[PDB]
Amino acid sequence: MKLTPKELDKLMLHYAGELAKKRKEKGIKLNYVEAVALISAHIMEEARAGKKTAAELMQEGRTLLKPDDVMDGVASMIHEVGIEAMFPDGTKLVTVHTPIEANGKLVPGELFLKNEDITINEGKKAVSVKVKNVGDRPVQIGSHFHFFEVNRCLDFDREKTFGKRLDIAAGTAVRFEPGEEKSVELIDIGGNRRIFGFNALVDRQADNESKKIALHRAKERGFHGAKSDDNYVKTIKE
């Protein structure tokens, strides 16, 4: 029976589960592991019998342990239980979300952040800009992305956006449904203000003069809102 290391992994897990079930049975509040296992182990058999579906087990797993079954803290700990089992249609990932609940007051590593708010991008004079997606597909722009160089579909005043990024939480972004129109918030790029890459429009220092070029290239490259070439005077490098 050519046993794949994957299979052994499970055969092990399974019994990790059996112990678990066998313990509460004898009336004992299950802990982190014990819960996790149990939950997991279940799905594995359920997938075996080939009855329940993934969508289902994903849910039914939330009905395996009552808040009075596990130890105080366990509930909060298991944010979720991921486990792949082999269904007649093939292996699948059953992700069981929050299988138990806060029937207790204890929460390991709980957070006591001090109320109040943090101000993103301190003193950074923002600016609003109309932005409509004139394309058939959606477009998500990011925090520190040179807005000016966004997809050649977001129609807006590139000129007003040169050297700036969506004034938002570092990391996140903004979505544009084909057609959708909005007014984004965008502050200037800090640091040395050295734009390099993206759509190859700048690749230099954010200068009011470098700008001329970007605006020119975007025109030729087709980005909506990229003004026009009012008799452009070429430079010796661009």
Partner 1 sequence: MKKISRKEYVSMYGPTTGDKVRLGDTDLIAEVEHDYTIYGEELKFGGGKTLREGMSQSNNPSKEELDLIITNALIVDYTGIYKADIGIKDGKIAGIGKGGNKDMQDGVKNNLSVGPATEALAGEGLIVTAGGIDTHIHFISPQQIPTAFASGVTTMIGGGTGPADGTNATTITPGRRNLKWMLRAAEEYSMNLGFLAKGNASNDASLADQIEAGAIGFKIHEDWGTTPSAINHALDVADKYDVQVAIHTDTLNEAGCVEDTMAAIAGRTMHTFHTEGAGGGHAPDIIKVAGEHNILPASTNPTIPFTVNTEAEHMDMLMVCHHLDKSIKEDVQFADSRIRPQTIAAEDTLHDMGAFSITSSDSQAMGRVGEVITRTWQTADKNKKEFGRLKEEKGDNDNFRIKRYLSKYTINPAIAHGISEYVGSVEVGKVADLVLWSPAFFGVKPNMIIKGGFIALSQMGDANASIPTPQPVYYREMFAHHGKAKYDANITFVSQAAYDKGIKEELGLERQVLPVKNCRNVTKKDMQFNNTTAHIEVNPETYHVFVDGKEVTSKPANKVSLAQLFSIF
Q: How far is CA 74 from the centre of its chain?
A: 26
User: What minimum distance in Å lies between the beta carbon of 27 and its own copies?
Assistant: 8
Could you tell me if 145 and 198 are in contact, meaning their C-beta atoms sit under 8 angstroms apart? yes
- Which two tokens mark 141? 């722009």
Look up residue 137 and give its DSSP letter.
S
Q: Binder to partner 1 among 64, 65, 74, 215 (CB under 8 A)?
A: 74
Q: How many residues bind its own copies (CB under 8 A)?
A: 22
Q: Contact between 52 and its own copies (CB under 8 A)?
A: no
**Residue in 27, 63, 88, 105 binding partner 1, rule: CB under 8 A:** 88
Among partner 1, its own copies, none, partner that 64 touches (CB below 5 to 8 angstroms by kind): none
Do residues 10 and 44 lie in contact, with contact meaning Cβ atoms separated by under 8 Å? yes
Instruction: Please identify which residue in 27, 105, 125, 228 interacts with partner 1, judged by CB under 8 A.
Output: 125
**Interface with partner 1, residue 196, by CB under 8 A:** yes
89 interacts with partner 1 by CB under 8 A:
yes
On the CB side of 33, CA atoms within 13 Å amount to: 9
Handedness of CA 190, 199, 175, 135 (dihedral sign): positive
> Is residue 49 a contact point for its own copies (CB under 8 A)?
yes
- The nearer residue to its own copies, 36 or 166, going by C-beta atoms, is 36
Closest to its own copies by CB, 7 vs 229, is: 7
Binding to partner 1 by residue 204, rule CB under 8 A?
Answer: yes
DSSP lists the bridge partners of residue 128 as: 185
* Among positions 5, 21, 25, 32, the unique one binding its own copies when judged by CB under 8 A: 32
Phi, psi for residue 84 in degrees, rounded to 5: -95, 130
One-letter amino acid at 201 equals L
H helical segments located in 62-206: 74-77, 158-161
**Among partner 1, its own copies, none, residue 138 binds (CB under 5-8 Å by kind):** partner 1
Beta bridge pairs of residue 166: 186
Match 């596990």 to its residue by tokens.
70
Chain residues that interact with its own copies, rule: CB under 8 A:
1, 3, 7-8, 11-12, 14-16, 19, 23, 26-28, 32-33, 36-37, 45, 48-50
